[PDB]
Assembly symmetry: D3
Homo-oligomer: 190 residues x 6
């Protein structure tokens, strides 16, 4: 057995961003992990991650085109260009913990099994954990990370509040993904 | 923020039982928690929990009647009688992270949203975490615990390997349940 | 073939309680049945059942804790204590003809297969029949009745209006449950 | 309240056909019901129903074309012609307690809510009751019966073993259908 | 390979009726097809189809009884009588691209797999194509057409705007149905 | 109304690749369409598309990483590099007409609404049409195409056999996608 630190935040959400990234990088370095997978909708957390990465490869997972308005991206080109210049990979694809079922539930009614899994992760462990899982599958399916332990970072709405060590998998073998360690999360999710 | 210990086990399953209970009791006492909710199919973990509880109220959650063979219980009367003599509460009811949908998926085919949630908890966090959640809802619905933070304990197949601090909820408000802290779990679930 | 009496009530609901119990007990005694399984939310029907049981074992199935408000019971302690003094068993657990799917349908939308079965029983045969089935599975899963024919009693909202002879089963073998006889029910369910 | 006869058969299935029809006609006449809705796959029960109808209008509900082999009917033309000559209506359409979902569950896997309702009716009340319900909705949707109480007759595999008094409804208002009385059914469904 | 004409209409709906029928009949005759399957709710398109059929057998598929109001038909008797006099077959049965699931989604919430298929056909190819498919399965299940290529015609709300050459199938082998050719459809569905 | 050519192939599959691309490019140029979205698993169809594009922008949609083996890509780096050199965009992301539901149906059983839509497209219109739709949503979600009419190309297993003019949409507004024209498809899908 391994006794490790876990950090619990008093509140969820964006105030926790810098500490989450610090702890994420700290654990990655202890484990010899190479990839830091970070959710960033508009680019703030991505930029902070690059500043703090200390040599880790940063894989930024952003919103699918059309998440807010069809055909539009939340992260603007000038931000994306700077992230790429600083060596980030950018993953932009469908959100795999809802998928096409979101169109059906929104327009016609009734949620799917996938959406139920998403909501149980949100409720039990917080939105940031749900996102950690979701972005890891997306990064894997998009070919941005290998099937090796990575550190994933997500949050509630904006910024970051949760970091995990996770073994990735794909949309066709989701039950092979595994949370190895929880580095930090809000004690209070809501 | 709160920096706490989390213990990761190298293997899942029954070898971790005594350490899981020790750590569960340790955290409950730090937090002023009164109830220890423990999964025990045949009674072994329940008996160990009572020995180690140091004044906590132990709520034992066992298998539903008929889990293996219709009309039969896995925990035998002599064990149940001893647990009750030592002050345990016993919860015996339907397993709420499958429910009647298990009859449908087994006989007719296709899993439900509830069963999908269960499997995602098993795969991401291990069977013991899934059980921690499940038994907490069952204990709440059966009227054995209040809606206050409790420590829940479960494992892979037999014994215990996972302990959490959890805010309970019921079958009709499941998304109000929340994992506040993870005390210990297997690093490797399988 | 066996020609038997069935009693059809003109209206559903609580006005039928005493006659339903009378007919339930009458049929149980004809068949040599030992257990009378009765739904009672607040305790009225349970108390009447005990008065009328004539030596049958009464198994009272009540609401899950949290059915109305989280952490609260509809049947109050003083009633529960009196029922136990008079020899009733009390079953309090999750309602198995909805289960965790009720949280999903209420919060996120869309009903499950289990909830669809429940509604078809309510519509075709009345709420009291649906309850008869539901409480029999619950009583079985909670270990309160054997897998032998029992008489079950339920109603529309309050009291009783339907009684059946039923072969129990569990949440994992629901399709083995069987209605052997319908003793009484409302001709008009609504 | 109304005290009536119900007849319970010792075995399910085809041996009960003549008695089921006799009892069905008897009850229809007591109630002033005009329509007798009868399941007949190959025509035997339909022919017997016409012989025994004593002035009731017989609505025969048969298998959908393709139930056994695509493009083929189980009831042959010579039988259909004789039934029509004797004044029967013939309903031949999709089986509405499975519908298109049967193609999905058979080819791709997983049963629907509709198929789950069907199976619960089969298990709790027997196949003949399930059929009584199903054929009443089909007869209504096909325009063969009005929305008035009718007597419906069905069975296990062949012949008849169950008769009910039922208020019809359609595929779009199924929960308005109601079983008013159960005239006869097998005590033992299987 | 076969180079053929397809006609795209600028608008969906009833304005396209006469041209759709003309093109449908034209293609049927080129292929030696015998049956023209036409959706007609109130009878207008059916009557026009008979006028234009030039010796094809017209199979009219109308609304299920109760589509608007329980127990009522949209096509009135005087129209049905005239269609039959002119040699049409009339199919009136449950709408198989929703079925009983429509009662569940309307009353209780959440759409089925069948309803999701229907909506995807409506959105991708227009309501008229969805109807072409639906009425072909209905006509097959009702025994009105053989399992041979037919031309099917449907539209948006009223009239016709889409015609296809289709290989029929039944509710239990839906995935054997196949669109061989699209004769005409709206370029703009909405 | 617009009378246009549609080409029907006698057989599905890879033999149709060059003609499908020729017809796709022909129609795009007639309409002033700028983007040709092409499915290519291993790269063959992509390379042919670039050769034949005549100035259109080619958006290649390939398999998700892990489609065959976790962590592996079907299109090898040397092919991807050449496609990029020749000006193709490459979309690699989760397959949105199955998504995470594929893990659930494969491991646990039962298909989703999304998978049912996919299968209905495959059966009615052929695998190549299904792919045309799927890759258009993926290309949109990945930010590779605007919400303007595009020509999409897909096939049965390998190569191409179907081309459409399609208005894209995203995973959250799928029912806004629309097939404007079918350029070519197999008359016989299987
Ligand atoms: C693919 C994706 C899915 C997300 N899902 C959720 C969600 O379910 N709940 C939530 O609160 N935030 C969600 N987020 C937000 C992230 O957790 C994170 O707070 C955000 O991307 C950071 O953006 P910023 O760097 O611009 O602040 C999601 C983000 C992404 C990229
Ligand atoms: C309600 C209930 C559900 C359970 N579900 C699972 C499960 O999903 N997977 C698993 O490996 N063990 C499961 N278990 C087993 C428990 O996690 C634990 O290992 C067991 O109850 C301990 O029994 P013992 O004390 O007799 O060893 C379940 C136990 C209970 C009581
Ligand atoms: C587990 C459970 C489920 C019930 N479900 C329903 C229901 O679906 N519809 C309904 O009208 N009543 C339902 N009831 C109410 C019972 O049928 C019965 O009328 C009630 O429990 C009697 O309570 P009383 O004795 O306090 O009057 C349910 C009761 C229980 C205990
Ligand atoms: C629409 C339809 C559905 C049926 N479904 C079932 C069924 O679920 N189970 C069963 O045992 N028989 C089923 N049957 C059979 C009937 O209950 C009845 O036994 C049969 O139609 C009588 O045919 P016969 O007169 O040729 O003997 C069905 C029949 C029809 C027409
Ligand atoms: C079984 C059936 C299902 C139909 N479903 C739809 C539908 O989904 N959307 C729609 O716009 N029209 C639908 N229609 C309407 C038809 O496509 C067609 O426009 C109509 O039946 C023509 O009726 P009329 O001849 O009285 O104008 C449906 C019609 C039938 C008979
Ligand atoms: C995202 C994606 C999904 C696909 N789904 C299917 C499918 O459902 N059925 C099928 O026969 N082919 C499917 N294909 C194969 C394509 O239609 C096409 O034949 C193939 O990608 C061409 O690869 P090649 O250029 O290496 O021959 C799919 C391809 C992709 C990229």
């Amino acid at each position: 057995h391994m006794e490790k630190k876990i950090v619990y935040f008093n509140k969820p959400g964006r105030e926790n961003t810098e500490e989450t990234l610090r702890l994420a990088v700290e654990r990655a370095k202890e484990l010899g992990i190479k990839h830091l997978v970070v959710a960033s909708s508009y680019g703030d957390t991505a930029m902070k991650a690059l500043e703090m990465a200390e040599g880790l490869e940063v894989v930024v997972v952003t919103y699918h085109t059309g998440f807010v308005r069809e055909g539009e991206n939340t992260m603007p080109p000038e931000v994306e260009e700077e992230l790429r210049k600083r060596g980030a990979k950018i993953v932009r694809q469908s959100h795999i913990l809802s998928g096409l079922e979101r169109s059906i539930s929104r327009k016609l009614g009734g949620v799917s099994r996938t959406e139920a899994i998403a909501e149980a992760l949100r409720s039990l462990f917080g939105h940031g954990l749900k996102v950690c899982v979701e972005i890891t599958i997306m990064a894997a399916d998009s070919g941005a990370i290998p099937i090796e332990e990575v550190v994933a970072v997500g949050g509630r709405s904006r910024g970051a509040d949760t970091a995990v060590v996770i073994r990735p998998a794909h949309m066709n073998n989701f039950f092979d993904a595994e949370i190895k360690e929880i580095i930090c999360m809000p004690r209070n999710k809501r």
